[PDB]
Design a protein around this ligand. Sequence first.
Ligand SMILES: Cc1ccncc1NC(=O)CNC(=O)Cc1cccnc1
Ligand SMILES: Cc1ccncc1NC(=O)CNC(=O)Cc1cccnc1
Lengths: 304, 304
Amino acid sequence: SGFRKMAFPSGKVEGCMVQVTCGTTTLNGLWLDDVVYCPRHVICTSEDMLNPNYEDLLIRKSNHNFLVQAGNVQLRVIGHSMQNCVLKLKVDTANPKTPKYKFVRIQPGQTFSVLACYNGSPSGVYQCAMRPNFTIKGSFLNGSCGSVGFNIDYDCVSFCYMHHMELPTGVHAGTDLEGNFYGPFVDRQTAQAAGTDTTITVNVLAWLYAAVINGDRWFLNRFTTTLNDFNLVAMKYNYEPLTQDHVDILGPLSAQTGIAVLDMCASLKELLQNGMNGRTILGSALLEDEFTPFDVVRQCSGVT
Amino acid sequence: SGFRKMAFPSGKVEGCMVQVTCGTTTLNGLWLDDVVYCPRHVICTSEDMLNPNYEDLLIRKSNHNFLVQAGNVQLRVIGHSMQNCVLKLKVDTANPKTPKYKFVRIQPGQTFSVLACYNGSPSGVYQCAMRPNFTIKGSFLNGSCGSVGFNIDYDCVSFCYMHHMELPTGVHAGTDLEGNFYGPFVDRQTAQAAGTDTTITVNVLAWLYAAVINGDRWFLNRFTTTLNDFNLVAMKYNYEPLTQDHVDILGPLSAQTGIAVLDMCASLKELLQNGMNGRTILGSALLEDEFTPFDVVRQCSGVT
Ligand SMILES: Cc1ccncc1NC(=O)CNC(=O)Cc1cccnc1
Ligand SMILES: Cc1ccncc1NC(=O)CNC(=O)Cc1cccnc1
């Protein structure tokens, strides 16, 4: 028993982190096979970031201008290309620690682990969710760009995020491993304000199920609701609409606990309207939304 | 910017996890050099756990009764001994992935990362704190015993915890790597109730400093207090007393933010007396106490 915000074991990703330097800018790179992936803004100075023309800035760079270091050994760069907002640096050595991997583009509400790195060295691992406004609330300082987000399915690492930007509001923006930003963000130091950070309803419900499985049941009430009635309350509280697809995804948690999804929705509706009244659920005084239904099933069943 | 509950990168510890089976009981072991450390209750059946005589139960076990598997390869056990509540199984092969390591016994209030494992396989990593009542609030299911807690200082892993028990209240108990339980707990399936789970005051203050560094400043007030006045309020709210040693440890955070430790104590005192009023600090509606002052400095400076 017990339920924790849990990241994937990071070892497989640690074996992929490298340091990438271009001129005076140093950030992180991801070494998979004989390619090093990194944010294309490695070629910019902080001044260039105000209004960069990446294609133009890249013409002034050759293979030998990208310095790649894995541990304390230098990798030889034999090619470089820009794919969307990432640079792919072909090196002459395949990463011997390359795990089985995939590049996936996740949907808002999906969670993942981030291995925060500085100078190609891992500092820590934490669990994030892609917010409904396509930002992530991470912990990233100067030099953390190129740190990646991932999920692991047994031995296959699905890379879903690469860190690029910190918006003026202190929230984070980045790309998938094909270099496409999540949301409308751009790799330019300019006014980029985020949209509404709504709560991931399906994740809150999955976490309420985890709370019941772990003995925290005070919030269970004698009511039920419908998707339409629930969604009227959800809109009012800046919660994402719940669809029949979300109800389907919560099916196994409903079956395991004997609590119908719409009954849990009614419990959630009362929590929104009445508040927590100084009480806690799984040690939290707010409704947690960074556990997907799959994460709850995995953690509650011990998936390795 | 941003502040997250962050665990250490777990790779170094993943390379140490093995599966240990004795009869019908399977749990995790920690392989360092040519020794595998595991909870001595691996020799018990669930029935033995009610009132086990470990020395007696151990007489019926030989080296060949301990099955140790690292990945999918079996290790040969050439010796076994009991040290307090852990078994040390000498194997004929030194773990080739043994990191630089130390065995440390931590004090209450200290944080660490847990690599939750099942059948010697890592499932996830999360950050814990040794509670003032010597329990930890982890996420551990059947088969997770032998999972370890650790801190990393650059390349040296300091192992501080090994999982042994889940108390009837769903909180966790375990030992250091010398097999001595933290607190008054025993490896027996019997009534063991935990003491008061007080809040780690020095950790809450360090986290309030992290909140200021990251822009969350609404809670800063126009007051100051003294250690004695603060401690009268702390006692009332089940917060640990704050000592001059804690004030000293918070010195660098006070210097970085220009906020005197006693002023932050006064802010905390008002948060206790007035409540959060529906507001959040670093995305939390309660005062977080599982970040030490050292963790705040590390995360806010990017220590790798
Ligand atoms: C400041 C920050 C913090 C965390 N994560 C990300 C960031 N960075 C940004 O949003 C914007 N980039 C910079 O200001 C620094 C820079 C210079 C030259 C080339 N690339 C980047
Ligand atoms: C039940 C549990 C869950 C999480 N962490 C720990 C535990 N385990 C316990 O507190 C007590 N041990 C058992 O009930 C299981 C067992 C059988 C035979 C030999 N050792 C252990």
